[PDB]
Design a binder for this molecule. Sequence first.
Ligand SMILES: *[C@@H]1O[C@H](CO)[C@@H](O)[C@H](O)[C@H]1NC(C)=O
Ligand SMILES: *[C@@H]1O[C@H](CO)[C@@H](O)[C@H](O)[C@H]1NC(C)=O
Ligand SMILES: *[C@@H]1O[C@H](CO)[C@@H](O)[C@H](O)[C@H]1NC(C)=O
Ligand SMILES: *[C@@H]1O[C@H](CO)[C@@H](O)[C@H](O)[C@H]1NC(C)=O
Ligand SMILES: *[C@@H]1O[C@H](CO)[C@@H](O)[C@H](O)[C@H]1NC(C)=O
Ligand SMILES: *[C@@H]1O[C@H](CO)[C@@H](O)[C@H](O)[C@H]1NC(C)=O
Ligand SMILES: *[C@@H]1O[C@H](CO)[C@@H](O)[C@H](O)[C@H]1NC(C)=O
Ligand SMILES: *[C@@H]1O[C@H](CO)[C@@H](O)[C@H](O)[C@H]1NC(C)=O
Ligand SMILES: *[C@@H]1O[C@H](CO)[C@@H](O)[C@H](O)[C@H]1NC(C)=O
Ligand SMILES: *[C@@H]1O[C@H](CO)[C@@H](O)[C@H](O)[C@H]1NC(C)=O
Ligand SMILES: *[C@@H]1O[C@H](CO)[C@@H](O)[C@H](O)[C@H]1NC(C)=O
Ligand SMILES: *[C@@H]1O[C@H](CO)[C@@H](O)[C@H](O)[C@H]1NC(C)=O
Lengths: 135, 135, 135
Amino acid sequence: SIDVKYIGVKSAYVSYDVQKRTIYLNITNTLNITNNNYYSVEVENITAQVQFSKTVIGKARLNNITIIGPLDMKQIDYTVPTVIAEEMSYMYDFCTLISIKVHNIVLMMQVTVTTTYFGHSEQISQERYQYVDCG
Amino acid sequence: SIDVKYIGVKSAYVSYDVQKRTIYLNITNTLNITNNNYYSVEVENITAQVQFSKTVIGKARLNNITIIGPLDMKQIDYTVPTVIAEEMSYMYDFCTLISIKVHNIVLMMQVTVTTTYFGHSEQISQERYQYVDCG
Amino acid sequence: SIDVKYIGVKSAYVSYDVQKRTIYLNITNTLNITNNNYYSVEVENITAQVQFSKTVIGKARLNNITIIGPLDMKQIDYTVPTVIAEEMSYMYDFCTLISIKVHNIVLMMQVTVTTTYFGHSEQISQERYQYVDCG
Ligand SMILES: *[C@@H]1O[C@H](CO)[C@@H](O)[C@H](O)[C@H]1NC(C)=O
Ligand SMILES: *[C@@H]1O[C@H](CO)[C@@H](O)[C@H](O)[C@H]1NC(C)=O
Ligand SMILES: *[C@@H]1O[C@H](CO)[C@@H](O)[C@H](O)[C@H]1NC(C)=O
Ligand SMILES: *[C@@H]1O[C@H](CO)[C@@H](O)[C@H](O)[C@H]1NC(C)=O
Ligand SMILES: *[C@@H]1O[C@H](CO)[C@@H](O)[C@H](O)[C@H]1NC(C)=O
Ligand SMILES: *[C@@H]1O[C@H](CO)[C@@H](O)[C@H](O)[C@H]1NC(C)=O
Ligand SMILES: *[C@@H]1O[C@H](CO)[C@@H](O)[C@H](O)[C@H]1NC(C)=O
Ligand SMILES: *[C@@H]1O[C@H](CO)[C@@H](O)[C@H](O)[C@H]1NC(C)=O
Ligand SMILES: *[C@@H]1O[C@H](CO)[C@@H](O)[C@H](O)[C@H]1NC(C)=O
Ligand SMILES: *[C@@H]1O[C@H](CO)[C@@H](O)[C@H](O)[C@H]1NC(C)=O
Ligand SMILES: *[C@@H]1O[C@H](CO)[C@@H](O)[C@H](O)[C@H]1NC(C)=O
Ligand SMILES: *[C@@H]1O[C@H](CO)[C@@H](O)[C@H](O)[C@H]1NC(C)=O
């Protein structure tokens, strides 16, 4: 990437910005902008690009062959008892959460067993997280 | 990518912005913008691009062959008892959540066993997360 | 991509913006914009692009062959008892949620066993998440 911007409130290339309780009297503004941009990005100049996978087996014996790729999740056990007993009680549960395996952004890319690749790979991830707001 | 922008409220290339309780008297504004843009992106100049998968087997014996790709989830057990007993009680559950395996954004890309690829791969992910807001 | 924008409220290329309780008197505005744009994107200049899958088997014996692609979910067990007993109680459940495996955006792309690919791959994902708002 080239220009990545994080701004919380206001992005302004030109801002004549005035707030309340201002007296804005006798202003003469003269403004000139000359903006010229060159973007020349991701230029590839190749005479030849060659890729292959060659596998050759001859007079061979294969047994007990196991191949397992990434992200192998096995024998997962979640046990979350919640045993709440009461005896003439006043329960006041205002802002309470019970979260198990909560995901916001999951990006899986180029997850294989055998891979051949030429080129550009780019991830851009922007957000404002706010899990709990309780008043 | 080239220009990625995060702004919370306001994006303005030109902003003559005025808030309340302003007296806006005697303003003479003269403004000129000359904006010129070149975008030249993802240019590929290739005389030849070659890709293959060749597999050759000769007079070979194969047995007990197992191939498993990525993302193999096996033997998953979620157990969430919620045993709530009462005895003349006043329960006040205002803003309570029970969330199990909640997903917002999941992007699966190029998830295989054998892959051959030439080119550009780009992910852009923008959001404003806010899980719980309770007053 | 080239220009990706996140703005919470207002995008304005030119904004003469006025809020309440303004007295807007004696304003002379003269404004000129000259905007010129070149977009030249995803240009491919190839004399030859070759792709194949060749598989050759000769006088070979194959047995116990198993191939499993990605995203293999097996033996999944969710058990969520909710046993709520009462004895002369006052239950006040205002804003409560029970969510199991809730998904918002799931994009599956290029998920195979064997793949050959040339080109451009792009994902763009924009949103405003807000799960729970209770007053
Ligand atoms: C604002 O400008 C005008 C013109 O030049 C002038 O007559 C006036 O007196 C100015 N305002 C004040 C408060 O002096
Ligand atoms: C911009 O505008 C002002 C206004 O008078 C002028 O003096 C200046 O020469 C201009 N510049 C260009 C580059 O156009
Ligand atoms: C890309 O490469 C080719 C061959 O090498 C060349 O003729 C061409 O001018 C190049 N392009 C740029 C923008 O440099
Ligand atoms: C490996 O081979 C033996 C016999 O040759 C077999 O009993 C065993 O199950 C094989 N392994 C797996 C993981 O299957
Ligand atoms: C605003 O401008 C006019 C014209 O120049 C001028 O007569 C007037 O007095 C100005 N306003 C004030 C409050 O001076
Ligand atoms: C922009 O406009 C102003 C207004 O008078 C002028 O003076 C200036 O020469 C202009 N510039 C261009 C580049 O057009
Ligand atoms: C792309 O490459 C070809 C051959 O190398 C060349 O003739 C052409 O001018 C190139 N294009 C650019 C924009 O550089
Ligand atoms: C491997 O081979 C043996 C016998 O040769 C068989 O009993 C076993 O089940 C095989 N493995 C699997 C995982 O099936
Ligand atoms: C607004 O402009 C006119 C014309 O120039 C002028 O006569 C008037 O006095 C101005 N307003 C004020 C409040 O001065
Ligand atoms: C824009 O308009 C203003 C208004 O007078 C003028 O002075 C300027 O020369 C113009 N510029 C162009 C590039 O047309
Ligand atoms: C694309 O490539 C061809 C052959 O290399 C060339 O003749 C043509 O001018 C190129 N196009 C651009 C826009 O560069
Ligand atoms: C593998 O082969 C054996 C006998 O050769 C068979 O009993 C077994 O079921 C095979 N494996 C699978 C997974 O079927």
